[PDB]
From Swiss-Prot:
Keywords: Cell membrane, Lipoprotein, Membrane, Palmitate, Signal, Transport. Monomer. Disulfide bonds: none annotated. Its main location: membrane. This is Membrane lipoprotein TmpC. The gene is tmpC. Belongs to the BMP lipoprotein family.
Length: 316
């Protein structure tokens, strides 16, 4: 036998180049470094959710990881039935449950940083608009736009953010279509926050550049710089809003493994903890740009600047 961590996805697969991938990599590192084991199951439909989480709980594993906000209901109900099983919910808040720990991220703060990068790049071409494609808007998803918009405005209040919602994290065909719509309108920079769907946005940006259009995309979850290489050397990825869901998974799995599981707590992984932000190295960002970004970053961490949780269009 061994200590086992089981992961349940709510959409797409572990090869999504972003969110599911980060979570699985984290659980995988935990396992490999501690001689433990791990496995996962994919569940695209919500009627598949409770059955997936329950089978894992029934195997009495070390920790069941619910990857994504679509799983919150199934987890609240499943964890009710299986009080002796530990559950970790990634990307949504679950409190008042001793056997549930939830990890959320200060993605508004991280997104502020790539908004600064987006605005500076847009200004370079004399653009007064930048694009934003998000997979869904439920749960904590709005934090991305709220922060992206704040970062853009911190550079130039006259630059407008144009938003498209895909209503799915697993349709790259739709991501590509929404990206073409935005680029066709004149936008030269798009921040994609759409998981698997986002891979279609990155593909459109690569196709566009090859086609002679000076466009850019900003990645998410992972450092997606290499995914954007289009001519052998250069990349269309301006930078990425990295989100260490892998560290969160790895750390909480280790806590469960060691007997220090913080049940009943919803833990925030932020900019200060370096759980969100931009990659260490950014080939497409100048030193001047990096300078401005790090300056904002320090101010947000020190709380000299508080990043909003909802964008202007979503505030009363
Ligand atoms: N398969 C998914 N299920 C739930 N949320 C997702 C999924 N893929 C991406 N996301 C959300 O969109 C963001 C950018 O991909 C992620 O950090 C996460 O918040």
């Amino acid at each position: 036998g061994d200590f086992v961590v089981g992961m349940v996805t709510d959409s797409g697969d572990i090869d999504d180049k972003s969110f599911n991938q980060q979570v699985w990599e984290g659980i995988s590192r935990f396992a490999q470094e501690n001689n433990a084991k791990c496995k996962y199951v994919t569940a695209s439909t919500d009627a598949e959710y409770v059955p997936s989480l329950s089978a894992f709980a029934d195997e009495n594993m070390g920790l069941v990881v619910a990857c994504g906000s679509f799983l919150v209901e199934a987890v609240i109900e499943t964890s009710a039935r299986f009080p002796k099983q530990k559950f970790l919910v990634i990307d949504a808040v679950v409190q008042d449950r001793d056997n549930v720990v939830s990890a959320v991220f200060g993605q508004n703060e991280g997104s502020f940083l790539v908004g600064v990068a987006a605005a500076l790049k847009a200004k370079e071409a004399g653009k007064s608009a930048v694009g934003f494609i998000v997979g869904m808007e439920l749960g904590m998803m709005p934090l991305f736009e709220a922060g992206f918009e704040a970062g853009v405005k911190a550079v130039d209040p006259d630059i407008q953010v144009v938003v498209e919602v895909a209503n799915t994290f697993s349709d790259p065909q739709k991501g590509q279509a929404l990206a073409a719509k935005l680029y066709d309108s004149g936008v030269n920079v798009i921040f994609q926050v759409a998981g698997g769907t986002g891979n279609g946005v990155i593909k459109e940006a690569r196709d566009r550049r090859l086609n002679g259009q000076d466009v850019w995309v900003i990645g998410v979850d992972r450092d997606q710089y290499m995914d954007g290489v289009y001519d052998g050397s250069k990349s269309v990825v301006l930078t990425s809003m990295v989100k260490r869901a892998d560290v969160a998974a790895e750390r909480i799995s280790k806590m469960a493994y060691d007997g220090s599981f913080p049940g009943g707590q919803s833990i925030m992984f932020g900019l200060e903890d370096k759980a969100v932000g931009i990659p260490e190295e950014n080939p497409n960002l100048s030193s001047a740009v990096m300078e401005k970004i790090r300056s904002f970053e320090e101010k947000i961490v020190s709380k000299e600047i508080v990043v909003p949780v909802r964008s202007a269009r979503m505030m009363n």
